[PDB]
Scaffold this active site. Sequence first.
Site, PDB file in Angstrom:
ATOM      1  N   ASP A  97       4.166   2.177   7.229  1.00 26.21           N
ATOM      2  CA  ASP A  97       5.154   1.009   6.834  1.00 26.21           C
ATOM      3  C   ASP A  97       6.413   0.770   6.846  1.00 26.21           C
ATOM      4  OD1 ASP A  97       6.734   1.087   3.851  1.00 26.21           O
ATOM      5  OD2 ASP A  97       4.871   2.631   2.884  1.00 26.21           O
ATOM      6  N   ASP A 153       7.163   5.401   7.438  1.00 26.52           N
ATOM      7  CA  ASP A 153       7.671   4.993   8.177  1.00 26.52           C
ATOM      8  C   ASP A 153       8.938   4.897   9.033  1.00 26.52           C
ATOM      9  OD1 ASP A 153       9.404   6.201   6.302  1.00 26.52           O
ATOM     10  OD2 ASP A 153      10.648   4.794   5.279  1.00 26.52           O
TER      11      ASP A 153
END
Length: 572
Positions: free
Chosen positions: A393, A374
Amino acid sequence: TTANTHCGADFCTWWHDSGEINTQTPVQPGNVRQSHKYSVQVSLAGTNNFHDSFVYESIPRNGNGRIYAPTDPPNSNTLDSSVDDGISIEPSIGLNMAWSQFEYSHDVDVKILATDGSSLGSPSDVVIRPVSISYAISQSDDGGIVIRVPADANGRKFSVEFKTDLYTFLSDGNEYVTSGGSVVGVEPTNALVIFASPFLPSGMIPHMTPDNTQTMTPGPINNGDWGAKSILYFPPGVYWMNQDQSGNSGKLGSNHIRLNSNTYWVYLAPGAYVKGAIEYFTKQNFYATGHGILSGENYVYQANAGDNYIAVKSDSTSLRMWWHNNLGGGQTWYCVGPTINAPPFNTMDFNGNSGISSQISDYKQVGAFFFQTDGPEIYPNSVVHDVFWHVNDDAIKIYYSGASVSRATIWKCHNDPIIQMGWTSRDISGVTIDTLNVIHTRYIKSETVVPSAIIGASPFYASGMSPDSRKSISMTVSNVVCEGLCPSLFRITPLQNYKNFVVKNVAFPDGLQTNSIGTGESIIPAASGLTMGLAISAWTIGGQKVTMENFQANSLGQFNIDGSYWGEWQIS
């Protein structure tokens, strides 16, 4: 043989004397993976005086393959066969990401040539993303492609894409397939990204003396070599973690830099390449600046810093690229200039006390093929601008009030949404996201638990929880473009109210997916007692306006919002 670089106040390029062409295995410790297909050069605009600019390359699994421990032989399949690391077909079709960065303050020309016998094609065969900013492109007599890049205080960060190099990702709804199925993405086999960066603000280059700075020497980083000074400085060169925590040498990906509490600034020179990761301990404001690279390429998937850096997930101890576990309160992180490559896990978390915020700009993330890669946390009152992030992500995690994100370009693989707001009940206001360009996605599956959407909220992370009607999320999202056959605009499982939630000027020029996988459909299910106060305007798909007459699931908007919310939301 010798590169011809240039470094002045007009523009600056650099090289590495230990470049290695390698598409299959880890590079040597002191080497840097170099593009097997492209060269990049820079000239002052119109002068035909071209200077070499190094082209880095990053590959799925980093050449390590599916391994459980960083000391395992490459491509030896020691990871348990049941673990999906986010990679499947990509190695067999040759997928990789190459990039080149330079600094500039005046208009330049950027020249690209092939080195592997390829023909790049004519200028009309080239697409540069994000398509919101167009370029003058020409062809030189040697077959090279030349791009005019005008000076810009914010710089430019773009993907150069050649028609005959494009790969078409196909899915049957469960896995990628080599033929049949449905088209879920079209992108370069051999990606090439250019970072034309402005020189740093003067306040973001530290004033360094022998008394306040530890100057690192290119070569292996042994335990404690980073010292205990105010500033840690990596001048041009290649550096790599070379020991485990016990001090045994000849081990890559087996430790990270735990800074002394005295050290509040990490400065990466242009042309510095560091194989490692940074954990701060200081209680004062802290910094990561400069035009170098921090690479996680020697770390295995989910590398657990609390357990010998092996591939066992821990939310608390799996390794972040930028980390803190001892915050004191009243702190700000200043991140201006760095590029991270090949993160093994979540990229950034700062823990210990809630009084934290970040100022993040001219910040890049590449080679993030693994699941769980992420973007950085967006702490209260953060200001983020001029970023380019490759992710598999959540890209932009809106969990906190007051934050602004501007001029963000996102290259998505196949997991979780662009914007994430879910997992628990949250009370948020004062957030603005503006000028968001989603230049690629390639979702295998249509999902809601991990929402395959631009604007997403995952359901509760844990059982026995109830949506909270006393909480609400409010924000403004404006000037959004998604390129390619795109995923749905909204997939929100409501865990609290949505109120004064503005979404304006959103374009899908190539259309939504309309295949049997179903990824193009927006989904907002019933949630008793909660309001869905969405104010949507200027939403277009394929150049046509979405209105109250064509929003529906089987029409243009594909907007399957539950009928219980009727009247609370509007499209205009």
